[PDB]
Design a protein around this ligand. Sequence first.
Ligand SMILES: [Mg+2]
Lengths: 133, 138, 159, 49, 137, 350
Amino acid sequence: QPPISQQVKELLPVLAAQPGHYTTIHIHGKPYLVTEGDTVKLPFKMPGVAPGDVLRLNRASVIGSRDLTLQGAPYVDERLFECRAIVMGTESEPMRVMIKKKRRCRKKKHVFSKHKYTVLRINQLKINDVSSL
Amino acid sequence: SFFRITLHRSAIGLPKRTHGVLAALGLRRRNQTVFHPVEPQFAGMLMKVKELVRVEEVPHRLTKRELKDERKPDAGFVVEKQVRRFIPGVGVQDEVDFSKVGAVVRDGKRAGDLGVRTRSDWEVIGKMKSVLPKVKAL
Amino acid sequence: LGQGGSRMLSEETKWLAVTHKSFDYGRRGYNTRLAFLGRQIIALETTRSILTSPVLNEPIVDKYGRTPYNHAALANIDKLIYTQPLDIMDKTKIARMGIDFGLLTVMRWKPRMPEDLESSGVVVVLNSTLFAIIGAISLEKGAAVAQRIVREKILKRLG
Amino acid sequence: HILSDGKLTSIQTVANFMDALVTPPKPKKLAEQIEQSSILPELPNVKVY
Amino acid sequence: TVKALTQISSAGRNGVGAFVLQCKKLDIHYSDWAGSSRGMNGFIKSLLPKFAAANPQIEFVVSPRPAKHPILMGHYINGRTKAICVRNMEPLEILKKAELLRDASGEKPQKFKKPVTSTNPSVRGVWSPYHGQGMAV
Amino acid sequence: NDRFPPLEPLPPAAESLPSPLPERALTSAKLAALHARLNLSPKIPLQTLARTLVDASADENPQFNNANLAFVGQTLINYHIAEWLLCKYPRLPQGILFSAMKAYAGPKPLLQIARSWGVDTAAVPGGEVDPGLLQFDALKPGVAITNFGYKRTELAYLEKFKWRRGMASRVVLDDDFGDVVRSDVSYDRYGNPDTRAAAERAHAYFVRAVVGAIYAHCGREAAKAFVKAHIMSRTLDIAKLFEFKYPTRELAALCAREDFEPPVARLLSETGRQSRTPVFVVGIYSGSDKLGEGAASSLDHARFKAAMNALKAWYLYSPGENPRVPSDMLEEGAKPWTPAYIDMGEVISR
Ligand SMILES: [Mg+2]
């Protein structure tokens, strides 16, 4: 695979050594700035997942600490970090009714929308040691 | 070559003949891409809607499953561990961890065939009163 | 600690373990935190010396004539009905060990009343010092080296 | 066992005759029907009342 | 002098370290006489046995309830309860509804407002007009 | 009667027993689900998990009760957290250490771990109840476990006459959380603050028992993973367990002890002086080095807050988030142990 830049290889340990780290994961192109322990409530029902399933997130746009920020051009290389989630089931919204109507017209058309949302939990967010790489 | 036509604008207020030109090209909604061979018949068809479309010469025609795969975003995740689930038409698929790779689906008419722990298995585990962990491990 | 005891810990740590919080108003470090960990280590080794000790236990006769489950794994945990750890980890017993090995002429503390040492907290002060030595071995040398010293240099001297 | 004419006419083989006599009526209650099932009574986490 | 406070405890994050399915029980009420329970009776004989074996961490209780529509009542770890009336539904519709109770949580439904829910402080702390390069009007 | 036959077949001498029989646990759907919820290994039978749910207040017999499992479990939970807390924050003050041990393995958090497992309690203990319910007697005043701490000779005076106890004797004399040791029936009543304690006690003992059963059946390493997954995974802001009395004086004793030059408060920034809500940012500097910074509305409060932030930074020093633990050595062959940092102790000042 493409070798990592030498500048990223000398400052990644300085990034992993700081107290806290965050990341911007991309699920289907949409970003979510999260940290280990956060609960992501996606605006869609992920198909084919049950509670207890583990997802490995591999498209991260930004991984940074307080002072240092690691940016990938399209995305950061998967070898640098390791992010994992866990499916905590799906939740729903209260049914909302949309009334489409025009003036001086008695016909009121109703639209009932009640969508489901998958909830995740970032249970792992660690930066790898790339000394061997 | 081929003409790659994309309906950039609409024709909501243009004459009815302009809708007949967009119907022959196949442009129903906005930003819809069609591929038509480079020919005089199509070329004169684009000179009538040249204020609404964007034309481009492409070597090969793209299939329906390839025009949509260029706007498809990367999933951004990979299922590495699945928990036991019941598939209605297949059976009871056991747990699989793709990190060490096994979708074994056991179906039958008895609990033993499904591969789950039954009441009898709990009676055999309850009578094993001699099993003991090694002192070093305790 | 037997042969090699002095070298196991450290120059700074060995002094710190033997220093109580009453010496020099704590300006120089005290062993209070080490004494905390040391007690936790000792408790888990005296609880294991009762679970893994082969002894014949007399079963109790339940008033309601019930029969226990009688698992081989629960028979080891049913050994705490007759011998409790606190019976072995007696204040006077642990305190008497230090006084025997000359810990009273080495430790650094200030007794509130020097003449009446007993009523000035020698037992509590000696136990905190013996736990520290075990709380410092574990942190500096690992649990494996500590677990070998609690079974041989403490438990083997307290029956 | 009094066998109906609908049964005797439906019967065409010796095996059919045995089935009509030794097969008791099907239980109407779903509870008694579940007891005969092999999966549900054996599951540890399922209790049927 | 440092005095330790004794009124704060550790908060649990389900999913980190260990996961616990929020569904802890599932009541399956049928009726042998009610016509609206025809599908629920077919779900209990063909789809429930295997679905109950796929989720060994759920307590399934099948009890009759004559003169009443069939319901799926799931009890959750947080003490709340969700009941679903499955009248006139086919066996495969009941299995789709029992999967709704298994994946769901005891919480009440709420409109989608914010994706992320975090109880850990910002890695880069909140903005301050005093910890930067300043600003000139 | 004839119309309502009993749902559960039981002998006539079943409503009088203190707790359900061992063989009753092999026919309850609550245990089988509770066993499969915690992902316990098949080494632990259902007759053992049932014993963990029978508190010593519902059964006086040493067997059939949580007394022995809950003891072996409390020792493991306490030991694993004590070593992990000292390796993570080696400089925590002893009083804060007791508060943080009690914040993880105390009766309060252990009560929430039992409620997160879907453990429903039984109204009143009896042989008829299904073994899948946590059964205890909350009206029995004298129920308690055996602890390693000893009773203080001056206990009565401390409570009555407000005598001084200290924080260096608590390690030996007191319990693992610093607290002192030994500090028919009518159901027409309401809850009591004493019963709520028994409710907390019963839940804690059960969670401790589950760890005692895991240790007995699955061994030591299995118990450590269970504690590491369910207890140590909980999040706590240790910075919120700090209460300071005269922090500016304490910070001065720190620099004097470590030989750092005297601390000086400097006004980094300020705005809105002579207003209702001014902002003063003062930084405490030891020489050229900046120890801590604090912002408050009052000039004095800003100097106090800045001194606390400097003290919290000293005590909350962490070598790493996931440090190595001395318990990692006694298991299968691992890398050699490296000496961990041992702090002198918290500064004692005026
Ligand atoms: Mg129109």
